[PDB]
C-alpha cells in the first residue's frame, strides 16, 4: 500500500492505493484508505485494519474534541492511549493525518511524527512516492494535488504492494 | 479448505468443501463448514476450527439483534471483540458472512473487507475459487449457485487441502 | 510472471505478462515472454533469464533440424542436454513450446510434459491463469487466444508478480 | 504420490497414483507413475522427477542384459552408480521394480530392500497404502491387483499428495 | 501411539497399544490408553497425560449426568470448557469417546467430530490403522473387535511410536 | 549504493554514489562507481565488488570489439559466460552499461534488462532514484545529467547505503 | 543426571549421581538428588533445579496428609497444581518418588507415570541405567541396593552429564 | 539398528536387529545385518546401504587377501581408501568386524577402532546395548553369544529405531 | 543514532544525530533526541523510541522532586519501575542523563551506568564516537561542546544510523 | 585484531595488535600482525593466518620484482592471482601495504584499494581505530607513528577482539 | 578433549585425555591422543578425528626430512597443504606438537600458532588446562610434566569432554 501527502500554496492532500494483499495474490483492489475527520476539517489516510481505522479515527474525532481543533495535541493524546491502553494496544496501523495547521504521521509505539516538509509517505511504497514528490517539489511548479497523484503512480508503478485506485482528500485555506 | 460466495439477482451463495487437514493426512471430509444464522435470514462460511467457528458465530448473532440486524454495523463490533477480547483473540478463523444486503469477510485481525463484487473466496483455496468465479461471472449467464458450485470444484481440484464435498446455502431475496 | 497456452479449433497460443520483479518492486514492465521459433512454425513462451532463453530457444531450434519438425523428440532431445551439459546445467527457466502438433513445458529436470489439455499456466500466476482458463474452456464457445488473454488477465490481477502487458502468438492450421 | 506393488498367486503388480503437486497445488493429474521395462518382463514404479526415473529405469535396463535378468544383481549395481557417480548422484528418485522371481525397492542411499512379502509401498502414501494392503493381503482371498488398487484408493483417500488417477502394470507367472 | 475405535453390528469398540516415547526410547510399554466411564455404559480411549487423562475424563462422566447419557452433547458441553477455562486448557490430549448412541473425537480446540463411518484413528499411527481398518471394513465380514485388533497390529508394526500391547474395549446392544 | 541512468536528447549519463558499507559502517565514502569503457564510447556503474566489476567490464569490452561494438549483442554474451563459467559464476555484481543505442542492466543470473525508457536504477537505493528520476522525466524538461544527479541525492537522503559522493560519465550523440 | 530407582523383596532404594553442569562445565559434584520427605516414609530424588524441587516436593508432603499418605491419589493432585497454576507451572523438574506401595514419575505435564517393574529411570543418563537395571534385575540375585548403585555407575560412565558421586535413600518395608 | 559384539571365552560375535526406518515408519523389519567374510572366518555387522555393505565387504577381503589373514592391517588397508577414494567416499556406514585375532569398527572417517574390551555397540541403540553388555559382562558368567542376545533385546526395547529380529554370527577358537 | 556527552571544567553537554530509521530508509532526518528536563536543572540524550522517551523522562522529573533532585538516587528508583512494572517494562530506550553532579546511562535491564569520566556514548555509532571522544579529550584542550560536536559528526560519517544533524544542549555550572 | 596505517609529513606506519581470539577466549597474546617486506623497502600489516601471511607476503615480494618497486601494480598483480589460482583463492586475509609512494588494502576479493588520506583501519577494531586516527589527524600535530599507537590502544580499549600489545613500522622519505 | 602442553628445565610434555564423545554419550575412554614422530625426536597431541591426525601427523614427518628437522620451517608447509589441498582441507583436527626448540599449535587455517611460554592448551577443555597451567608455572617450582599432568585433571574436572585417562610423552634436551 502506499500513502502520501503532500503541502503546496495553501493546499494540503493525502492520497493513498487500493490495493489489500494477502501472501501474492491481491484480496481487493478498491480499499478506500483516505477518509475525512472531524466535521470534515481534518483529513487523513492509513495502512492497516479496515476496522482499527473506524476505532482510532473516531477516537482521533473526539481527542479533537477534548482540545478544541488543535490538531497536534489531539494527535499526541491519541498516540497516547494508544501505547496505554490494553486493550487499543493490539491495534496496528499507521495514521497519516493532516488539518490546515500541519500534518503528521502517527505509529503504534505512540510517536507523532512531523516530517520534513508536511511531505508523508507511509507504506511499503512509501519511499518510492517520497522520491517522486520530492523530485517534483524542487523541480516543478506542480500543485500540492498534482504531486501526490503523479507521486502515487511513480509509486503503484514500482511497488507490487501499490496499485492504481486512487482516493485522494484536499483541503484548502491560504 | 475454500469458502465461495457468489451473488447474482436476488440469489447469494456460499459454498464450502469438506475437507480437514491434519499435517498431510485428511482427517475428515464432510465438514459442515457453511451454515444459517440469525433466524435463517443470514448465511456464513468458515475457514478453521469448527468450535472456534461456532463461538464467533454465536457472537455474531448476539451482535444482529443489537443492531437490528444490520450486517456490516453488527459485524465490525464483532471485528472488535474478536482482536480486543483475551479469549475470542485466541480463537483462529476466517468469516464469510452474507444477507440481502451484502456480504464481507471478517477476520480476528479487526478487518471487515467486502470485496469487489460481494465476490468472496477465503481459505488456502480461495484465490482459484477466486478466480474461475470471476472468469464465469463475466463470460456467462449462470447464477450464483451455478458459480459458486463450478468455482468451488475447480478449487477442489488444484488445492491440495480442498475436497469436493460440498455445503451450500443459498438466500433468495430477488 | 503467468505464462499461458491453450489451444482450441486448429488454434495454439502461448501468452504471457511482462513484469520482472526484484524483492518488492519491478524492475521491468514489458518483457516479452513469448516468442516464435523454428522458421515460425513452432511457438514458446518462458520463464526466466533473457540468456537463458536466447540459449534454451536457439538450441530448440537446432534440435528441431535435427528431427523434421517433429516437436516432441527435439523437445526430448532437448531437456536431454538441459540436464547432462555441465554448462547447460546451470540454466534455470521454464519453457513453454507448442506446435501444430501439440504444445508442452520443460523443466531444467529435464522433463517433458504434456498437460491435460495442451492446457499450460507456469509461473507464480500460473494457477490463476488455470483456474480462469479451465473455467472458460469447459461452459463458453470462446476462442483458444480470447481464453489465454481473458486468463492471463485474471492471473495479473491476482498474481502480485503479474502485469497486464501481453506477448501472444497464435498459430493455425485445422 | 503413492506407489503400491502387491504379489499373490503368479501374479505380481504396481500402482501408482498420478498426482504431481508443487508446493500445495496440483501440477498435473494423470502422471503416468508405472510403466514396463526389459522386454515387458520387468514393472516398475517411481516417486519423484519422471525425467530423473526414466534415466534410472534406462541403466536398470542396461544393467538387466549385463546381468541376465537377474533383478536383484542387476540391481545392486544401480545401486551402486546411483551413489557413486556425479551426474546421477543428483537424481532425486525412489524406485520400486519387480519380475517374477522378486520386488525389491532401490534408492539413491545405494539401498536395495526387499519388503516382507514382497509388499512395497513408498511415496508419501506409502504407509497407508501398506497398512491397508496388509489388512487385505491377511484377511481376504483378494488378488494382487484387487489389493493395490484399494489400497491405493485408500492411500488418496488419507494422502494429500496423491489422487485417485491410477496406472497398474501387471505380471503373470504364475 | 495408535487409538482405533470402529462399530459394526451392534458392537462398538477403541482400542490402543501402550507405548509412551521419550526422545528416540521407550519409557513405558504398557500404558493403559482405553478406559471406561459413565458406570460402565461409555467407553473411551486417548493419547496424552496420564493425569490430563484422569481429569477430563472425570468432567466428561460429570457432564452426562447432567445431560443424561445424551453422549453427544456432553460431549460438546466438555470441549467446551476445555478451550475456555484459563486451567482446564493448558491440559493437551485426544480423547476417543463412543457410546451405544455413536462416537467422536474431541480436541483441545473444542471440536466434536463424528468421523465417516464411527471409525476413529488418533494417535501418530492413527493413518496407518484407519488405512487396516478400511481395508477390512470393506473386503470382509470381520467384527468391530477382530478390526481394530487387526488394524491396532498392523499400525504397531508401521508406527515406531505404536507397539503391540493392547487394551480394547468393547460394548454390545444391536 | 546506487547507479542511475537517464537519457535524453542525445545525451545519455550513469551516476553512482561512493559509499562502500561493511555491515553498519562506513568503509570508504569515495568509491568510484562508474567509468569509461572501449575507447570512451561506451559508460558504465555498477553495484558490488569493484575488482569484480572491473573483472566483467573487461570481458565486456573484449566482446565489444568481438562483435563491432554491438552492445546487446556483445552484452547477451556476457550475460552467457557470468551464469556458466566457474569463476566469473563466482562473481557478485550488477552492471549498468550504455553507449548511443540503449542502456541496459546485466546480472550474473544471464539476465539483459532495458527498463522503460533507457531508465535504469540499481542497488540497494536502486527504486527511490527511480521513483524520482521517473516524476522528474515526466513534469520536468531537465536534462539527464541534471535527473540523474538529482535523482542519486535524492536516492542519497533515503538510503541508508547510499551517500552524497557522485561520478558522472555521460555520453553525448545528440 | 540420573535418577534410578530399583525395587526387590521389601527393599526399594533411589539413587542419583552429583553432578550439575552449566554449559560445557560442571558446576557442582555432589549435588544432593535424593532425600526423605514425609517422616522419612517417603524416599524421592529429583531431575533439574534444586529449589524446584524443594518447592515440588514440600507441596508433595502437603498432598500426603491430605490423603493419609496414599502416594499415588496425594501425587495425582500434585500433577494438577504442577500444570494448572501460574507458578508452579513455572518450575522445571522431574520427580521420582517411592514408598512401600509403588514407585513413580511425576511430570509437570500433569502426567503420573509407573514403569513395568518399579523400576525407574529419569534423567539425561536415564536409559543407561535402565538399561543395565534390566539387565541386572533379569539374572542376578543382586538387590535393589546393588542395582541402583551398579545401574548408576554404568549410566555415570555412559552420559556426559552424569558423575561418579552417590546418594541414595532406601526404604525396607519386607 | 543396533549392532552389538562381544567376546569371552575363545568365543567372539556380532549381532544385529533388522529394523529399517523411513521418518516415522518401518520400511523393512528383517534386514540382515551381520554377515561373514574371508571365507568364513572373519565375521562382521554394519549399518548403512544393502549396497554399500556389498561393497565394503567385498572390498574388505581383497584385503584380507593382501594380508595373510591379518585382520587389523586389511581393516587399516580399509578404512584407508575408504577416505580417500573419490567415490569409495560417498559411501556411509559403520562395519564392526572380528575375527579370531581381534574385532574392531570402522568408520567412513578412516578410523580403526578397538574398544574396550572387544566390545563394540553401533547405531542408535548402541549405548543402551553396551550398558546392558556392560552390566551382563560384569556380573554374570553368561556367555558372549547369550551376551550380545540378551543385550540387544534390552536395546530393542529402549530404541524406537531397533527391534527384535537378529542375526548373530558366532565364532569359536580357544 | 548517536547520543555522546562529554563534561569539562563547570561544562557537560549532550549531543544527538537526528536520524530515524526504518529498513534501510531514512524516515526523519531532524528527530530531537536531546531535551531539557526538571526546570532545565537537567539534560538528557535518548536512543530509541520518543514517545517512550517522553515517558520514561516525565516520571524522571517526577523522582527527581521526590529525591530533592539527587540524579542517582532518583535515577536508580527509574532503574527500577522500568524492569518492574508491567506497561513501562515494555517501552524500549536508552538514557543519557546529567546535571551538575554527574552523567549517566539508563537502561531497562535496571542498569545505572556511569563511565570513566563522565563520557557517555550510546546508541548504534555510540562507541565511534566514543573514541573520537577519548583521543580528544586526551590530546587537546577542546572544551566539552566542541568534542561533543566533533565526536558527533565523526560517528556520524562511520555509523550508517547517524546522520548529521545535532541537538546539543549544555550546562554550565562552572 | 586491529591493523593501523598512516601517513603524515614523509612518515608512514602501520601498527597492530597482538590477540588471536577463538570461541570467547585468547589463544595468544603476541601475534605479530606487521612485517616488512621488498627489501625492507615496503611495509605491510595483515589480519589472518600465520601461513596465509608467509605465502602472501612472500608472492607480493616476488610481483614487486616483477614490476621495479613500484608498489601499486605488484599490488594490483597481487589481488590478480589472489582472485584466480584453484589454491590461492582458499586464502583468506586482509594486507594492508604502504610503501614510500602509496599505501593500500587487499582482499581476498582482488580489490585494490587506497582509502581516503591512505588512513587504513581494517579489523574487527579498524573503526574505533579510524574514529580516533581521524580525530587526532585533524585536531593535533602529532606525528604518524604517535597517531597509529594512541589509535591503536583507542582501539584495544573498545573491541574486545584486540589487546595492547604492538608491532609498528614505520617509514621515512621526505 | 584436552590437550596440554608444558616446558619447563630441558622437559617438554603434551598430554590429552582419551575421551571420545558422541552427542551425549561416551563412545570410548582410553583414546591415545599423543604420539611420537620422526624418530621419538617429537611428541605430537591433538583433538579430533585419530585417522585425520594420523594422516597429517604421517605428512608431517614427511615434511621435517624435508626441512632437516625444522619444527617451524616443516610446520609451516603442513600449514599451507592443509588449508590448500582437496582431501587435507577435509580432515577436521588440531595438532600440538613440540620438540627441543619449542611447541606450536597447527590449525587448518593455515595457522601455526606458539602461545606465550610454549604453554599450549587447546580442545574443548583447552582453556581450563590453561588457566590451571598457568597458575602452576607461576606460584610453584612443579615440573612440566607435573603440570601437564594436574592442569589436566583440573579441566577433566571442569571439561564435561574430557575425562581423567592419560597419555604422555616428554622429552628431555636439559
Request: no cysteine.
Given at each position: 500500500t502506499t500513502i502520501v501527502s503532500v503541502r503546496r500554496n495553501g493546499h494540503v492532500v493525502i492520497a493513498g492505493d487500493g490495493q489489500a494483499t494477502l501472501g501474492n495474490t491481491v484480496?481487493?483492489?478498491?480499499?478506500?484508505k483516505v477518509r475525512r475527520l472531524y466535521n470534515d476539517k481534518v483529513i487523513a489516510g492509513f495502512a492497516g485494519g479496515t476496522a482499527d481505522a473506524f476505532t482510532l479515527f473516531e477516537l482521533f474525532e473526539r481527542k479533537l474534541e477534548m482540545h478544541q481543533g488543535h490538531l497536534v495535541k489531539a494527535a499526541v493524546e491519541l498516540a497516547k492511549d494508544w501505547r496505554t491502553d490494553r486493550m487499543l494496544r493490539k491495534l496496528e496501523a499507521l495514521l497519516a493525518v493532516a488539518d490546515e495547521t500541519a500534518s503528521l504521521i502517527i505509529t503504534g509505539n505512540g510517536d507523532v511524527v512531523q516530517p520534513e516538509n508536511d511531505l508523508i509517505a507511509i507504506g511499503s511504497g512509501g519511499p518510492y512516492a517520497q522520491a517522486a514528490a520530492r523530485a517534483l517539489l524542487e523541480n516543478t511548479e506542480l500543485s500540492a494535488r498534482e504531486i501526490a497523484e503523479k507521486a502515487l503512480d511513480i509509486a503503484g508503478d514500482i511497488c507490487?504492494?501499490?496499485?492504481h485506485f486512487h482516493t485522494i482528500e484536499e483541503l484548502s485555506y491560504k
Open positions: 484480496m481487493k483492489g478498491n480499499v478506500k507490487i504492494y501499490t496499485n
